Design a protein around this ligand. Structure first.
Ligand code: B12
Ligand code: B12
Ligand SMILES: [K+]
Ligand SMILES: [K+]
Lengths: 179, 551, 137, 551, 137, 179
């Protein structure tokens, strides 16, 4: 284990940051996404891509909901740039932004099994660009028709599991990483 | 030490599918769970006071909504005392009229109607389905998407999809900002293939209503409702918000329907220890209670949950039968991939295809499944020839028709051109002649030249931002010499003014003719009555490609 | 007053159908759209038409349909922008009670939208009880 | 040009199938032909003088047999005057008992009952089929064959089949002289698999009955009847010869059935201008008229004929329903290949699968189709896991069960050893020990050591020529220490002595309890009544391989 | 005799199923097979059992089955290869009328097969009429 | 054409000849089997395989039925060895001999689409081997599960065709091949 909670997250005062928000069991009770990519290396590559574009990465844990859109919206709220990345334990990932309706977003990765470490890095990077108000090309659409046949039942099980750690009224916690 | 027979069996695509053992506490059980509520209703002074075992003091928002608008309180106590086996017999009895049952099923609680339908097998359910179906003629809806959000390809696939016989067509977006392009290309391409085909673009709720406020869609379907209160909340809505939402669409003259589907609540994490089918029945009653005319259900996007478990595909058929028995339009799914096997998927489709439903699938993929932005349908564009042969084999009207290559190329070309003029007329990032030609002959996005999507996205968003509306599409088509598509686009906008396509099951067939359950009443009374494939329709279905004349 | 024998209104009673600026179906032509005799402001369903539809529904045995159609008939008065605004306010954790009752109060006397004001008004009490207001997350 | 859409479509397997335009004059039209006879019956002095428009002066042998033996003349007039739509209604109404309908259908003429079922759709036929089925419990039969007549492979596969749940198994021969060997391997393998399975070897008629006289067979099924007189004559038989043959097998205590099938007459050259179903109706009535208990129909070996034309798969289902409506056991085809497409073959199966017939297939291939000496079945051994998951999906008893490899290998092994000992006692060409092993782990003939056919042949003929009877096999199993297979074999012969298994739909379940339509009476009265998958059998069915525990 | 309520005989009245030697189902042990004290010729269904199945068939409403059973009861006495001989003579173009009529007199006089003898005679008249005798091909 | 009618073929000439019984449309209204192989090559190759075994081969046309079993039966009675070979216009082929029930046989080739000219020669050989009374290995079994799917309808049509030239009461005519 490598994510220590360092107290309630606060609103970012400079806009050279991107907030990464993970769900309540990310890196805790779950360790790996839905095809075994370890949470550690997901977070490592997402940060790296942000870091590469001259932007700061700030990581918090959300408790109030396990839905990836609501996890992200909590981060797009505390974020100095108003940009967040939301991530579920099973690996589903969204790039959100302040002012957007919760079930809207800038970019969505809705079939987690198709995400690689490369993809994740790309996601960090695209977020950072949006943070500096560019218009990066969307990360290319990944779509496989057998992803649901193969993994939806697993996805629903992993999500039920993560959904046990949901805590009503808890505000996000700021995390210190151990990459 | 290896049996080769078992080695051959392990290589079977079906053994890739996801299969789960029943997990009753988390609601991973399709139907007939020991935990599901026993049916009861207590009605004090015209107000429901107890609903399938739950006291009014414990109601959640879904119970309150259902207890106040979803149940006929007038026959409720009476129909509750009737035997559930007898009611099930009456559902599949050919001589018990639909009009005699609807008074009873609408007075039932959610647990009551689940109890009746669970005594049935699939064959009884299909026998019930052909009678309860609200509209007499069956129909079909297709998906027309593509992994690049390519506008020209979308219009080409839409036009062919409409030429094949889909009456409704749905698009969606890989990138959300492209939406207005998708919509417009969907609408123009659909009207070129067949005037009257209805189009929707499935988005976040406020985004979609605004699009429709701008006049770029004809209807909306993916207005979601959910069967437990937490899941509904993670879906960012309540029944009152969805209820208001439904009446807003109708205040704009737009047809809409809810979408539910067994397994949602397991997939979104809170099933409250209840079977998929019971929770789905709360959805169906939410829909009824909100006053919405119709429902897309049959598991839909979560078909992986109920397929994993025993009796899942039967439970799918049962949720559709309940919808129709409640006098709602049923758009019965068949629109999402759940299996690697052609045998398994075919069995799942035949559950609605053989009886006929208001839409046999709510999203047959009009493009190859690689291009499908709902992550694959249960049927796609390479299945067309198969779907037609099963029509012909069984004498079943499955809503689609055999077509000739020379006809599709033409219609695909006209739609790419019409959209070429629109983009020109509106000052959008142009559509090259090279593009039009690709679109004509393509199978999927692989066959299509790249686009500047960053520019395309920029203009797409301008449509929202500057409120550019559907009359600009009309104007641009007339000035480009697509006066006929202009007139057809005008004529479908005119359907939002009369309100006739707001009623149960409404589609626009023909010569601007509305065809709904009000004027296409399902009158089934057994063999030789009700809807029967024959005439020209049967002629059209017989004439597949390859029928050789015995020389 | 309309029955299922009056349905479809455009085949049977097209003269009953008028737009919000008192236009006729036959006023929506390619030319009149081109010359701008007709505008997008012109193509909007009237409350009268929705109430016709509601009575056709009620006659077809579909009472809840008819209720929805009566709510819709009111909401025609309400502006597009304000519809969007009232829709987001009704979403979980968006509003306080008072903002809910203020919308209700605004729908009663700005737009005379008495069934829908009672609708919000119900939601507001129930959101209290079911804890779906701003701050309840 | 060339649309890429149509190039992808053009490679679909389905376009390899044979499709024909209806050719009414040669009888290439599955049902509802304009040329078919209208129902009539005139009865003078207790003798039929007019059948379906034909005068007794013009009768053919088929007409004479049906007119004298096949129709209940007491009610025939009453029934003929009844409205055919009301009668089709009664067939599917859940509330009109089977026993109120049998007295009427057995009073109808061939043309009358054709007229009845032709008003129905597939869904109506299925709802009718589950009530009219003679036996309450559905069952299944497999083909156990291989391309080299290898006796060791046959035995082994017979055993796995019997273990998978088939209740009757069938073999036949690439080389006719091998027959004795294939019959003994089948019987021995089957009984090792499950005591009570019934076995048959399908040959020329005189040949096959002598093999039953010798005791190497427990029933016969492919006792041919045909629906025009020319074809019957090329089948080398008449109604009177087939009727004598039938009571000859009963004279030796052997259960048997006839075999017919839509399309046999077009295939064999003389349809006399009539639809396939009508012609098939004449075959069902020959069977009824002979006094035979049951019928293998549903097109069977000629499925390429009705499948080629419109409404052909619905005609197949309807000929099964006539069959059962007439109170005969129905062994409902699903045994022959007609299509390269998995979708199409699955829809054809589900017609009998969903309602359940006495034998849902009469011949599921229990071996890979390369090894199938009836030229391939509609399902084969690579489909087992699919067939099992569809059971589980729909809650439909299709007669089979999931099995474990461990268990299978062992029973294929024991079967092989038991057969090796039999070839010992009788002094037959040696089955080696490497041969035993090969058959234990084989998938098909490809995995088996080659044999000396020519020596095998000389000794197989010996069996017949020296009249070596099944007692040799019994004694030869005790020598080897298969005193169980010996008794279990004796136990069959005890069932031959009682005659209980000669009645409609009989099968031997469990430890020798016959389950026929006399004691397993179908009592279907709609939902919750009649046969219902449930209890331990339902459990059996959900426990497919790959079901994960959700924790 | 028997009715559907006596069926399965094996189950309800095994004692109605017996040999001319008087054995029962009971000594169809593999033992007495092997001690050559039960033989092939003991394991042949008798006309009496077939007639009991015929009455059960007739009681279940299956008259045609019962008739088939009745004929079979007759044919139990006819030798195997003689059964084969008659069946082939009944096949197309194998026989003349007099042969068939001879077969029926054999069946009638020698084997007392009254129903089959009439069955064969009926066949013989009709194969004349429909041309299925030797030399009609 | 390639086959002329000499006249009524007659019984045994001596026990060293095979009869080739052919249906009524072979070389005549039909000139190829079900997948194009022309009759002349077929016949040519089966003659060859017989003659090759040192046996002579006679070549008769039957008219009594189109059925291959009854065509071959017609041939086998008329034959000095006991053995015949019957062939339909569509290509279905059997090796019969006298004594056998008409629908029994020595060898049967019941999937015509699978027969090649190579196979036809082995049928001839085996036949003569049978007439010489030796015990040939059975021509190996051909079996394609998609043969019916591909060809049954066409087989029905082609048999219906042949069957129109069937003649009740006609005895086989002898033929001499073109070659
Ligand atoms: C299953 C599915 C659903 C299910 C499950 C949602 C869930 N949260 O569990 C249902 C029907 C309930 C659902 C609802 C919605 N969906 Co959806 N959904 C899909 C679908 C068809 C397949 C996804 C999948 O099965 N992947 C395989 C598994 C193994 O991967 P997974 O990572 O574990 O997948 C998860 C994500 O896809 C997540 N998810 C699903 N939909 C959405 C939508 C948004 C906005 C977000 C943030 C996440 C998310 O749910 C899956 C299950 O946990 C995709 C199509 C696609 N191209 O993938 C559309 C898709 C992702 N959904 C979409 C939409 C619009 C929605 C809604 C907003 C619709 C509405 N009327 O409200 C709602 C959002 C509700 C919610 N809180 O997510 C769009 C997103 C467009 C975008 N943002 O660019 C897609 C791409 C296409 C579509 N039009 O249907 N959806
Ligand atoms: C279709 C079929 C039939 C059909 C069509 C027969 C016909 N004459 O039209 C029906 C059901 C009516 C039939 C009947 C019988 N058949 Co069959 N038939 C088949 C089957 C399943 C497939 C053939 C096919 O469609 N091939 C593809 C088409 C395109 O090829 P084709 O060359 O044109 O095929 C023709 C030949 O097969 C011919 N034919 C079919 N069966 C027989 C049997 C004999 C003895 C002969 C000489 C010819 C013949 O009929 C086909 C259509 O014209 C085969 C199985 C196999 N392994 O091939 C069994 C098969 C050939 N039949 C067989 C049997 C035993 C018979 C019967 C004798 C059964 C009976 N109870 O009488 C009868 C013979 C009647 C007759 N005059 O032929 C056996 C032969 C065994 C052997 N001799 O070694 C086979 C191998 C397996 C089986 N038991 O069904 N048969
Ligand atoms: K849809
Ligand atoms: K069979």
């Amino acid at each position: 284990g490598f994510l220590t909670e360092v107290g309630e997250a606060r609103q970012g005062t400079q806009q050279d940051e991107v907030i990464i928000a993970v769900g309540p069991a990310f890196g805790l009770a779950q360790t790996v996404n839905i095809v075994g990519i370890p949470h550690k290396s997901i977070l490592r590559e997402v940060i790296a891509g942000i870091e590469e574009e001259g932007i700061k990465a700030r990581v918090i844990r959300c408790f109030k909901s396990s839905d990836v859109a609501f996890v992200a919206v909590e981060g797009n709220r505390l974020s100095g740039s108003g940009i967040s990345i939301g991530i579920q334990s099973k690996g589903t990932t969204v790039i959100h932004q302040q002012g957007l309706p919760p079930l809207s977003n800038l970019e969505l990765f809705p079939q987690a099994p198709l995400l690689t470490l490369e993809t994740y890095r790309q996601i960090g990077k695209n977020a950072a660009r949006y943070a500096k108000r560019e218009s990066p090309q969307p990360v290319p659409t990944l779509n496989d028709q057998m992803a649901r046949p193969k993994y939806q039942a697993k996805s629903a099980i992993l999500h039920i599991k993560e959904t046990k750690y949901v805590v009503t009224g808890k505000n996000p916690q700021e995390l210190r990483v151990a990459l | 030490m290896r049996s080769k027979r078992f080695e051959a069996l392990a290589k079977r695509p079906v053994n890739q599918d996801g299969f789960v053992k029943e997990w009753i506490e988390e609601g991973f059980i399709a139907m007939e769970s020991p935990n599901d509520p026993k049916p009861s209703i207590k009605i004090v002074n015209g107000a429901v006071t107890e609903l399938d075992g739950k006291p009014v003091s414990d109601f959640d928002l879904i119970d309150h909504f259902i207890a106040r608008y979803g149940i006929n309180l007038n026959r409720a106590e009476e129909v509750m005392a009737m035997d559930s086996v007898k009611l099930a017999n009456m559902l599949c009895d050919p001589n018990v009229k639909r009009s005699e049952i609807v008074p009873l099923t609408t007075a039932m609680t959610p647990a009551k109607i689940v109890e009746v339908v669970s005594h049935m097998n699939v064959v009884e359910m299909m026998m019930a389905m052909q009678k309860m179906r609200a509209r007499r003629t069956p129909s079909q809806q297709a998906h027309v998407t593509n992994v690049k959000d390519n506008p020209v390809q979308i219009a080409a696939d839409a036009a062919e999809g409409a030429w094949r016989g889909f009456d409704e067509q749905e698009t969606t977006v890989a990138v959300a900002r492209y939406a207005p392009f998708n919509a417009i290309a969907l609408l123009v391409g659909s009207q070129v293939g067949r005037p009257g085909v209805l189009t929707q673009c499935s988005l976040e709720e406020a985004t979609e209503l605004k699009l429709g406020m701008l006049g770029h869609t004809c209807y909306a379907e993916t207005i979601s409702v959910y069967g437990t209160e937490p899941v509904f909340t993670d879906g960012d809505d309540t029944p009152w918000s969805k209820g208001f939402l439904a009446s807003s669409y109708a205040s704009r003259g737009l047809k809409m329907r809810f979408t539910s589907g067994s397994g949602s609540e397991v997939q979104m994490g809170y099933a409250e220890g209840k079977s998929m089918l019971y929770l789905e029945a709360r959805c169906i009653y939410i829909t009824k209670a909100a006053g919405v005319q119709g429902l897309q259900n049959g598991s839909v996007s979560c078909i992986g949950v109920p397929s994993a478990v025993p009796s899942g595909i039967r439970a799918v058929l049962a949720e559709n039968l309940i919808c129709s028995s409640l006098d709602l339009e049923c758009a019965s799914s068949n629109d999402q991939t759940f299996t690697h096997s052609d045998m398994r998927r075919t069995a799942r489709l035949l559950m609605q295809f053989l009886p006929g439903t208001d839409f046999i699938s709510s999203g047959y993929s009009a493009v190859p499944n690689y291009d499908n932005m709902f992550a694959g349908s249960n049927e796609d564009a390479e299945d067309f020839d198969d779907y037609n042969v099963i029509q012909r084999d069984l004498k079943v009207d499955g809503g689609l028709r055999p077509v000739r290559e020379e006809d599709v190329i033409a219609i695909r070309n006209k739609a790419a051109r019409a959209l070429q003029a629109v983009f020109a007329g509106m000052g959008l990032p142009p559509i090259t002649d090279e593009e039009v030609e690709a679109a004509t002959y393509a199978h999927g996005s692989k066959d299509m030249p790249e686009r500047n999507i960053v520019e395309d996205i920029k203009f797409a968003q301008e449509i929202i931002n500057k409120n550019r509306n559907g009359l600009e599409v009309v104007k641009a088509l007339a000035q480009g010499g697509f006066t006929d598509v202009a007139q057809d686009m005008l004529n479908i906008q005119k359907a939002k003014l009369t309100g006739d396509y707001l009623h149960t099951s409404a589609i626009i067939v023909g010569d601007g003719q509305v065809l709904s359950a009000v004027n296409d009443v399902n009158d089934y009374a057994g063999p030789a009555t009700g809807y029967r494939l024959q005439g020209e329709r049967w002629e059209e279905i017989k004439n597949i490609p390859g029928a050789l004349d015995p020389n | 007053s309309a029955r299922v024998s009056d349905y479809p209104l455009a085949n049977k009673h097209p003269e009953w159908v008028k737009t919000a600026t008192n236009k006729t179906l036959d006023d929506f032509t390619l030319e009149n759209v081109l010359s701008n005799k007709v505008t997008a402001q012109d193509m909007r369903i009237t409350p009268e038409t929705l109430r016709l539809q509601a009575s056709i529904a009620k006659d077809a045995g579909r009472d809840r349909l008819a209720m929805n159609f009566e709510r819709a008939a009111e909401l025609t008065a309400v502006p597009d922008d304000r519809i969007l605004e009232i829709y987001n306010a009704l979403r979980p954790y968006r509003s306080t009670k008072e903002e809910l009752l203020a919308i209700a109060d605004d729908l009663e006397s700005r737009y005379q939208a008495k069934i829908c004001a009672a609708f919000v008004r119900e939601a507001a009490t129930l959101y209290v009880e079911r804890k779906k207001l701003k701050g309840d997350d």
